[PDB]
Structure 1
Amino acid sequence: KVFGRCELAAAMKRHGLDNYRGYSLGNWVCAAKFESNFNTQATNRNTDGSTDYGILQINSRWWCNDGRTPGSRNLCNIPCSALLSSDITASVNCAKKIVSDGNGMNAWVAWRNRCKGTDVQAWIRGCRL
């Protein structure tokens, strides 16, 4: 599914991301925009052979199982395919684990490089929430 901007803001709010670990909703929407362009089915293969999945491009080296990332973990205890669903539950629940892991949203390099420190509230401007 490709979400609209406000549609995703609303869904992420329903799923408990607004101010999760202190990160306002616009931070999450901004991250999703630059990770996946709001496409739940986004995948990208990394140089190390791992793959990133879903709206927040969660990586198979640590977080999900895809069966083809040698030496990896599955800390979210999910198949990576779950991260591609139109239902964002798996992506959100895993993101909550990731952002609690120590470096906060810096885990998402696109967030650090494109969202961190910016006027992220613009991502939720004009949305019914």
Structure 2
Amino acid sequence: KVFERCELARTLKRLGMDGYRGISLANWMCLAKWESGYNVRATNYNAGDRSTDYGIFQINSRYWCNDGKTPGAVNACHLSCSALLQDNIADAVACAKRVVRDPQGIRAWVAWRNRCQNRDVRQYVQGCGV
């Protein structure tokens, strides 16, 4: 499933993402937009280090979820990476919350730095009723 902008915005708000660890809802929307284009099935293999990014937030298999084929990996979210490909994004959200509980916060994703940081991100939630 590929979420529509406002549909996702309302879903994330209900899941308690607004202001989570100081991160505004619009920041999470900007992150999802640039990582997967709001597509829960997005997957990207990194030939360079043998890890894969999964789902709407493109969470990496080396640290956060287990896919079994990533060398020297941990599973901090204690989830199979398969869980991050579901239409129901509850597990992906719980794992995203875990990722930002680390010192880097939202900066853990380089795309956030490149296209969201210091930018006007209001556009991602405008008119959505959140």
Structure 1 unaligned segments of length 5 or more: list them.
none
* Partner AA of 2:75 in structure 1: N
* CA distance in 1 between partners of 2:94 and 2:118 (Å): 24
Structure 1 position 120, deviation (Å): 1.2
Deviations 1:47-101 (A, max 9, x none): 2000000000000000000010011000000000100110111110001010111
* Partner AA of 1:25 in structure 2: L
* CA distance in 2 between partners of 1:117 and 1:12 (Å): 22
Structure 2 unaligned segments of length 5 or more: list them.
none
- 117-126 or 75-84, which deviates more: 117-126
**Counterpart of 1:54?**
55
**Counterpart of 2:39?**
39
TM-score, scaled to structure 2: 0.97
TM-score, scaled to structure 1: 0.98
* CA distance in 2 between partners of 1:57 and 1:85 (Å): 13
**Counterpart of 1:83?**
84
Partner SS for 1:11: helix
Structure 1 position 119, deviation (Å): 1.0
* CA distance in 2 between partners of 1:73 and 1:48 (Å): 14
1:68 aligns with 2:69: yes
* CA distance in 2 between partners of 1:15 and 1:87 (Å): 11
**Counterpart of 1:6?**
6
1:23 aligns with 2:20: no
* CA distance in 1 between partners of 2:117 and 2:8 (Å): 19
Runs of 4 or more off by more than 3 Å in structure 1? Answer: none
Give me the identity figure in percent. 60
The Cα RMSD (Å) is 0.6
